[PDB]
Amino acid sequence: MIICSVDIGIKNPAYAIFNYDNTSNTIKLIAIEKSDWTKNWERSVARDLTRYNPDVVILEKQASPNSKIIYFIKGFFYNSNTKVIVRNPTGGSYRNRAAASIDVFIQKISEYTDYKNDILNKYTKLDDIANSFNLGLSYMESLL
Amino acid sequence: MIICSVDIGIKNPAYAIFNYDNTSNTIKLIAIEKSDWTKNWERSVARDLTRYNPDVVILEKQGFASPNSKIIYFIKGFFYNSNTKVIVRNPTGGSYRNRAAASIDVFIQKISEYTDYKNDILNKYTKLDDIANSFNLGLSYMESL
């Protein structure tokens, strides 16, 4: 089973891709990447989602130009075999949320990837990365 | 060529289906029906759009603050990379009731040129707002053709 969580944005989208092994009840992080959806966001989203052929897609619940992406994905995976689930954002002011997410990320990712240093060196801004990672985790917590 | 114009609404959706013959430069109305998208709007929209297998789909432009852009972009994703083109068109002044009145007048007087089935269309559907809207939207698209 392949899981695709997506922090949705135009200038700063991000996606985390997990592999779910129901046999071993374990979870392995495959890849988190920062994307760009400013030039033909439709084709960019289709590409980025179908790249790894996911079994389930997790979208962050958000008048914003991102609900169009939510429903574009919903229509794009409707007649397919991929389930699209929209989840709530994974307290305080809205500005504190990104800091809490980055802390939880930098402290929780080491259990899943073993590739922490290169992820931190490649991507300096950890907002959307942390958001997608925590969104995927919050979905999979309901599974186990 | 089959053209599908869609007046978008949850409790009051409507769709007009035209047949476009580029050879004869003529246009024939096939069917206009009022739909219901209150129970699983996703399945309802997929059903109503794939019903006649259209070559092009015409969608009404809606603001992001309206609960209908979700239907717009659901359709866009639903027909993406397919052989059906999805085009969003502008609404075909004053109050919404004056807009609907002008649309109903243009509809009730212009449909007879295309369907020959005016009397039964008027007898079946009493409220003509969204029906007229979808018909005029399809016409406004084909005028560009």
Numbering used by the authors:
A (entry chain B): 1 to 62, 65 to 92, 95 to 148
B (entry chain A): 1 to 92, 95 to 147
Quote the authors verbatim.
The DNA resolvases orthologous to the A22 protein of vaccinia virus play an essential role in poxviral replication, by resolving HJ structures formed at the inverted repeat junctions in a concatemer of linear genomic DNAs. The poxvirus resolvases belong to the RNaseH/retroviral integrase superfamily of DNA-modifying enzymes that employ a conserved metal-dependent mechanism, including the prototypical bacterial RuvC HJ DNA resolvase. The fowlpox virus resolvase (Fpr) forms a stable dimer as other homologous resolvases14–17 and was found to bind to various structural motifs on the HJ DNA, revealing flexibility of the Fpr dimer in binding to a wide range of DNA structures. The 150-residue Fpr protein has the characteristic architecture of enzymes from the retrovirus integrase/RNase H superfamily, comprising a single layer of β-sheet sandwiched between α-helices.
Initial crystallization of C151stop Fpr with a catalytic mutation D135N to abolish the nuclease activity, in the presence of a HJ DNA yielded large crystals that diffracted only up to 7~8 Å resolution. Four additional surface conformational entropy reduction mutations, K65A, K102A, K103A, and Q104A, helped improve crystal quality and the structure was determined and refined to 3.1 Å. A HJ DNA substrate, HJ 13/13 with four 13 bp arms, was required for crystallization of Fpr and present in the washed crystals. However, no DNA molecules were observed in the electron density map and the structure obtained was that of Fpr in the APO (DNA-free) form. Divalent cadmium ion used in the crystallization reservoir solution at 10 mM concentration, was identified in the active center pocket, coordinated by the acidic active site residues, D7, E60, D132, and N135 (D135 in the wild-type). In the Fpr dimer, αB helices from each protomer form the major dimer interface. The dimer interface is mainly formed by the hydrophobic interactions, including F64, Y73, F74, F78, and Y80. A notable difference is that the Cpr crystal structure does not have clear electron density for the helix αD, whereas the Fpr structure shows a well ordered αD helix with clear electron density. In contrast, the active sites and the surrounding DNA-binding surfaces of the two Fpr monomers are not well separated due to the shorter αB and the loop preceding the αB helix, and they form a larger flat pocket.
